[PDB]
Point group: D2
Chain length 251, copies 4
Amino acid sequence: SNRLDGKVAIITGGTLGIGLAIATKFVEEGAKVMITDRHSDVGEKAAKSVGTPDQIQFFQHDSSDEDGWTKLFDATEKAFGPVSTLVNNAGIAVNKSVEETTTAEWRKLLAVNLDGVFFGTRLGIQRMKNKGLGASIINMSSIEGFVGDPSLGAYNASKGAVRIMSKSAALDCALKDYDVRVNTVHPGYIKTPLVDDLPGAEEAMSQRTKTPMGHIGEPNDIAYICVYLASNESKFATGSEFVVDGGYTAQ
Amino acid sequence: SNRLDGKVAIITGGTLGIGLAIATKFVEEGAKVMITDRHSDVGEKAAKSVGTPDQIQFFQHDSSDEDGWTKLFDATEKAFGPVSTLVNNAGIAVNKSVEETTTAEWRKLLAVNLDGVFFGTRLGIQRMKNKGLGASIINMSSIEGFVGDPSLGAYNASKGAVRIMSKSAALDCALKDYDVRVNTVHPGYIKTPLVDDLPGAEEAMSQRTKTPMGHIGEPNDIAYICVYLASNESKFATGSEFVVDGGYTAQ
Amino acid sequence: SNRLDGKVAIITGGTLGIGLAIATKFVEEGAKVMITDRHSDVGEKAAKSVGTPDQIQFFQHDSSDEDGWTKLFDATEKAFGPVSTLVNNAGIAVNKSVEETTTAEWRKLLAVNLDGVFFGTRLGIQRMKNKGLGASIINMSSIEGFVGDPSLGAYNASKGAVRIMSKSAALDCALKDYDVRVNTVHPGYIKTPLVDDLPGAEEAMSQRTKTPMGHIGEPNDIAYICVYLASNESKFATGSEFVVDGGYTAQ
Amino acid sequence: SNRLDGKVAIITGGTLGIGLAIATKFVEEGAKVMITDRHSDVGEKAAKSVGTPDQIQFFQHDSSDEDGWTKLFDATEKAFGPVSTLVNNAGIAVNKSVEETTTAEWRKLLAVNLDGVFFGTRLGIQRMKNKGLGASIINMSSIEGFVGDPSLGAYNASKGAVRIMSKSAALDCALKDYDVRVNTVHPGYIKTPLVDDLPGAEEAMSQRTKTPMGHIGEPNDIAYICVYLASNESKFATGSEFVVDGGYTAQ
Ligand SMILES: [Mg+2]
Ligand SMILES: [Mg+2]
């Protein structure tokens, strides 16, 4: 209870699935939250579903949009005061091997999953440093930041990039006494409405050769590790990877 | 608040430092706790310092003592009901390179840091499986489960062993639907009375070439990640390493 | 001797330092080699310094140039027959933290270090698969694919990306029986003329807190691991990272 | 050719499978070799099958036998001159989960796979340091030093231990300018007569969910990476893990 007292969080891709659960638990624990999505039609509904405007609001933004990042931080600060917490959660996937990835697919995926995370991390450091906020940047990787998948080539590239970029940022922030921590979270497979819409997907993900627990996770599994990382409870954790994957990478 | 509702935890080496902080936060979050130490004279004091006998008790036990493990589980169950949570935290160190480690030092360290963790893990699985407890075994490694230290040869061996043994156990428990998770926690350097008694130690540990944050942690840093891992919040986390090290292993 | 009998290799950035040593040892071991560089003025000199045109030639190419990749493979095949071996070695660095990286710096570095490696890997798979060549793609990471450096933010992103992308490609090639292996090589610090031109650099790199051996490597250190990976000696190695770093990442 | 000119190597468990292939290629590359096994009846045959007594000899030794280690080094030095190279390859397996491992099984496996490797590493450092030999200690892990197997609990413990202990030793040797390198080799599944005798084993190991290449390796796959690590070609490689696993750990 009140584990995020006084925190102000931006969560990209916060209107659905993992991002929405993070937003929900953040609000429950006392944080003010701005959620984003590229779209407008889902965001206001999603915010109101979690709480009132004094707790959580929506801001339309594509995380690949560099200039939109300043606007997002400015809107969040206007609503709630200085931002203390950034969850870079927006991402997309291309279901292609490296061999079969078009250059357009490559650039599109990297724009969201890599450039977007860089834009957010860079701006977050600049805006959150040296303010006594207990600032925390949580960058969403996945199991595909550790292991390959033959049909997620560009996705693997992006997750490996975010995994190690985050360490660079963590180190610089620590060495410069910025009061900003940077860590990555690595979900395995998580059940969402989007997964439910893909016939056979949950079953395939739940095979023991994929997920040893024999079932997949749920959005709150990722929410709870994010609460820990946003909270001052994790004030000595930086530059590290936090894996919640049902055993996927343990075998 | 009440994040460990109904849990019953054993914490080896729970009378000091990290173990004591884990015990303290476990009690605060609603767990019943049995702490151990090889000795008798510190344990009762330490338990009473945290709470009353209905919350926390002491049991004298050397974790290298195989038969004493059954006795410890039996005493905890008698006091509090079936054990749901085991933190294998008892450990020792030998300040020797591999080259300069005597065989007696080798066997002594492995008896506590490796055999003891095996005895606890094996018995914990047997006692906690198939009971709907949301059981969790938390095995204490350190940064020395990831990286070498030229003057901690046997210690490195033990921490590497626990790191990967824990994955084996996690997988078997998951595949067999035992309702037991197994994970490791990897502290960097943590300030304790024992560190305070070693002249120059905290300062050396706090150099940026060691800990990028420029200071060391505190016992509660390790307590909070243990609460998360004991709690049902981490029900999809198994077979993974949770690092809280001020950036030590990020560079 | 003759460890690369019949092999035909492309080495990007093969006119200097590590790339040139790889080229030299490849020729010594019986491979035909095409080396590249963005420039023209160094390449012909460098090739002739290693061997005759029937052994090694130069092709001007910037690895960020997608269309130039087809041209490079076509020129190499014309000179030497079908390409069996690709070493993606071309890379640049920006000496900036994530916080201080401009977007132009970000895109420039990723164009060479990430896009270029993707273009080469994708085309290499397409051109080398299913031909009985014992094909091998060797992607040059560095220690900065494993650990952060606070002043190499974009570089870290690129090396983490290549590390995990390479695993995706390795897996797809293995599962599809393509007869293409993909692995990464991770040099620590290596002495070259460019390092010699930077006052204090080798000394800083040689401090024990950086490189435990107390000195840095030399280009042939990286050449020899590349010979092993190009050779049929490594026919069961794929999807793996080969580190030659004087102990840098071991502590 | 002559890649191990002048080297003198001890290979534990060198009479069969991987160890025998290492011995064979070592002799081919100009090293003198002493192979061991607990038994006498296989060793002399195995040595003669590789070469003459001036190239390779046998010494009966159980690697768990501490005092026998001095005797082994003394016999090798008598035959061939000072030892430059140690391959700790002797190992056993227990096919049990952590839960089902008896204490006797635990101690037996650790005696060979952990104590034996420690005894060899410790003595090797003492005997090989400061002699200008280009000394190299190669410690045999496996994929089970990286990932768990639910039915190889004690084995996982041993391989994780050797993985990180080896880093400690590498660092101490590097920092003290001992001219000794220490690295680990991590085979996936390898076809041997022992595997052939286990019905269904190779087929199970060759499933794509285990080995992405769809087949297992052969002893020479491990021999060739050992040649590289024993050779002065790898003079800047220390404290690192060299994986040859058909993609097993890449997914
Ligand atoms: Mg390090
Ligand atoms: Mg795996």
